[PDB]
Amino acid sequence: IVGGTSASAGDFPFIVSISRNGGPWCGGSLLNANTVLTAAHCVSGYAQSGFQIRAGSLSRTSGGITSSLSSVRVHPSYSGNNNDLAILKLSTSIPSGGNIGYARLAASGSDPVAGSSATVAGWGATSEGGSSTPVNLLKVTVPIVSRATCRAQYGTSAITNQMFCAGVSSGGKDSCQGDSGGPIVDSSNTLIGAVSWGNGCARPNYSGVYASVGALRSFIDTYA
Numbered sequence: 001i002v003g004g005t006s007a008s009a010g011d012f013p014f015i016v017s018i019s020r021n022g023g024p025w026c027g028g029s030l031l032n033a034n035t036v037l038t039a040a041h042c043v044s045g046y047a048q049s050g051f052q053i054r055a056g057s058l059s060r061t062s063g064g065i066t067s068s069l070s071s072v073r074v075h076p077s078y079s080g081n082n083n084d085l086a087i088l089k090l091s092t093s094i095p096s097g098g099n100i101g102y103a104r105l106a107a108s109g110s111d112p113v114a115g116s117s118a119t120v121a122g123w124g125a126t127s128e129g130g131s132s133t134p135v136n137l138l139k140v141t142v143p144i145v146s147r148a149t150c151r152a153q154y155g156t157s158a159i160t161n162q163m164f165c166a167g168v169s170s171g172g173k174d175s176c177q178g179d180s181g182g183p184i185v186d187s188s189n190t191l192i193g194a195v196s197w198g199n200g201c202a203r204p205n206y207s208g209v210y211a212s213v214g215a216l217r218s219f220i221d222t223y224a
Contacts, residue, residue, distance in 0.1 A: 001122055002202040003173035004138035007058060011139065012121050013101030014191070015183060016053045017060035018042060024133045027122045027182025028088065029103045029191055030055055033095060034070075035224045036088040037103070038181030039194050039211065040078040043086050048072055053090065056100040058136045060123045065100070067092035075219050082160050084196045084211040087223045103183070103191045108221075110192075110214035111164065114146035117187045118166050120195060120208070124178025128201040133178055140173045142166045145207045153206055154199070162215040164193060167207035174208045176201035184210050 016036055018026040028038035036053055043051070048069045056064030067090040075083040096102055112118065121139040126132075143166065150165035151158070159165065166184065167174055175182075175195045184193040193210035200206060213220070 001120065001124060001138035001140050001179060002126055002128070002176050004126070004140040007121055007137040007139045009058060010099050012137070012183060012185070013099055014103040015121060015137065016055045017123055018181065019052045019054070019060065020046070020050045024060055024123055024178055025051075026178070026180045027195065028053065029183050029194070030094060030100070031220070031224045032102055033093040034090045036090065037194060037220065038086055038088060039196055040074040040084045040086040041196075042181045043072050043088065044074050044078065053088070055094050056098065061135055065092070065094050067094065073223050075216060081197045081209070083162050083216065085194060085216050085219065087220065104189070105217065105220065106186075106190055106192045106214040108214065108217040111212065112144045112186065112192050112214075114144050116144050117141055118144055118184050118192065119187075120166070120175050120179070120182070120184040122175060122179030122182040122195065124180070125176040125201070128176060130176070142168055142173050142208070150207050150209070154209075159209065162212050163196065163209050164212050165207035165209055169205060171202045171204035174198065174202035
């Protein structure tokens with residue numbers, strides 16, 4: 001997260017950190033006791049034994065409850081940057097309570113409204129190209145950018161109906177490498193997307209791009 005501030009305990013009861021080969025890798029959202037939502041690009045084709053999830057902590061390295069993975073299912077139309085969502089099944093079930101809870105999802109068919117406020121969270125880099133990652137969770141609030149303006153930035157074909165955009169035109173606030181797969185929520189803390197891609201991090205006139213939960217709800221509901 002670039003331009004962010006520290007999250008507090010219980011801000012995102014459903015957030016998980018995803019390590020790979022013992023190092024930081026991605027974020028995700030806990031949907032139920034044995035199911036995590038993340039970005040397909042975080043997991044597709046990699047050895048599943050390399051991943052560990054941690055729930056219930058602000059720290060990616062300590063605290064909370066950990067689990068290995070039992071299975072990985074990517075969206076059937078994942079291709080390039082499009083449809084960038086995956087469902088992970090956990091070997092160890094994670095009960096709700098305390099600072100752990102399960103995500104509330106955007107309604108099927110919904111699309112975030114331009115100019116509304118969204119909050120994104122993760123343990124990724126705090127500058128583009130940054131090598132050091134924070135131990136504790138950061139968050140930032142940015143407005144939704146209309147799909148039309150996002151298409152003016154990236155190209156008409158680059159931004160699909162299963163993506164939405166968020167950022168500030170002058171830059172300085174964004175998700176970045178290591179944030180992929182983690183949550184973006186609306187102002188009610190409903191899960192509207194997962195961190196997916198963008199041109200660098202926090203650049204003027206290049207919004208962050210997010211996979212849309214509202215658009216991909218049928219996939220989630222089938223396999224969660």
